[PDB]
Structure formats: structure tokens, C-alpha cells
Write an enzyme that holds these catalytic residues in place. Sequence first.
Site, PDB file in Angstrom:
ATOM      1  CG  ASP A  10     100.419  80.719 103.435  1.00 25.13           C
ATOM      2  OD1 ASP A  10     100.028  80.022 102.476  1.00 25.13           O
ATOM      3  OD2 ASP A  10     100.424  81.947 103.469  1.00 25.13           O
ATOM      4  N   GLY A  11     101.511  77.774 102.459  1.00 27.20           N
ATOM      5  CA  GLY A  11     102.365  77.110 101.490  1.00 27.20           C
ATOM      6  C   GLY A  11     102.383  77.948 100.228  1.00 27.20           C
ATOM      7  CD  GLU A  48      97.402  75.654  99.470  1.00 26.90           C
ATOM      8  OE1 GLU A  48      96.352  75.068  99.614  1.00 26.90           O
ATOM      9  OE2 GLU A  48      97.568  76.544  98.606  1.00 26.90           O
ATOM     10  CG  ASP A  70      95.310  81.808 103.236  1.00 20.90           C
ATOM     11  OD1 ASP A  70      96.116  80.842 103.266  1.00 20.90           O
ATOM     12  OD2 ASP A  70      95.620  82.839 102.572  1.00 20.90           O
ATOM     13  CG  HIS A 124      91.087  90.120 102.292  1.00 26.96           C
ATOM     14  ND1 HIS A 124      90.378  88.997 101.964  1.00 26.96           N
ATOM     15  CD2 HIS A 124      90.228  90.958 102.905  1.00 26.96           C
ATOM     16  CE1 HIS A 124      89.133  89.154 102.346  1.00 26.96           C
ATOM     17  NE2 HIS A 124      89.017  90.321 102.917  1.00 26.96           N
ATOM     18  CG  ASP A 134     102.056  84.884 102.129  1.00 23.58           C
ATOM     19  OD1 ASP A 134     102.254  84.163 101.150  1.00 23.58           O
ATOM     20  OD2 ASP A 134     101.784  86.067 101.928  1.00 23.58           O
TER      21      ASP A 134
END
Length: 155
Positions: A10-11, A48, A70, A124, A134
Site C-alpha cells: 500500500d502507498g 504504491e 488494492d 474496503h 495502509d
Amino acid sequence: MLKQVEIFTDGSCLGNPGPGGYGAILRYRGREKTFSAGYTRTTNNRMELMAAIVALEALKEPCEVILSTDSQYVRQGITQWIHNWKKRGWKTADKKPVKNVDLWQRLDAALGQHQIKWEWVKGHAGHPENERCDELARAAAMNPTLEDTGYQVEV
């Protein structure tokens, strides 16, 4: 011990450009390695991509990997662009270098040794591991210590 390397990335970025960071969790050998760093001036897309790079660069031999993220930008690049960019020597239609060519090339080199299975999760509905990425990425952007050398307002 798992029979497959598991990677979660995640980024995050506070601006465009702004301070940003990444979080990556890697399950390799019998360990769980966590990577995270913040950069003073960068972008969401670059963070990311950096998430995924550092995790794969940790891999010392050809593995069978499952990468979970994601990130639309990594996904878009991997599913629609990367192929075409290699055929065109990493240039756009108007013949300039692609945006973030520095990172896409770094990522390209890092995937090479491996048998990778990509898992595109919705924001989500990720695993407990994506949420921690995250959280890590968000905390890193708040206390940035590195310089994103390859960032350009420019190309």
C-alpha cells in the site's frame, strides 16, 4: 511454513506532490518482514509502486509469489501498459519517456526472476494485511525521512 511467498502493499501521499510513504508486508521463509518509509516530496502512484519494489527486491531467489494490493495504478500498469511499453522502448506515443519510467523499470527488473500471481483487492474488502499496510503507509507520510530522487514535476 507457507509454500508461497505472500506480499501485501500500500502507498499513501498527502499531496501532489506531498510527503508520502509505503507499507509492505512480506511472508518469506518462516518470517514476516515489514517495510515502511516516508519521502518528503512524492506522489501516491510512486509510493504504491515503491511498496511493491522493496518487497520483491527482498527476494533472494526465484519464488512463487502472491501479491495483494488494492492499487489501481500498479494494476493498470501490470494489466494494460507494461507489455506495450516494453515493445515501444518505454516511451509514449509522442515519443517521450513514460511517467515514472524509473520505478516501472525497477519493478520490471524485480518481477523477472519470479512466478507471480496478482490479487487485486478492493479497498474496503482487503485482508487484515492490506489494512496494516495502509496504516503503515499513512504513518510513514507523517514522518518522512527519505528523498524521492526519481520524482519530477516534469517528465
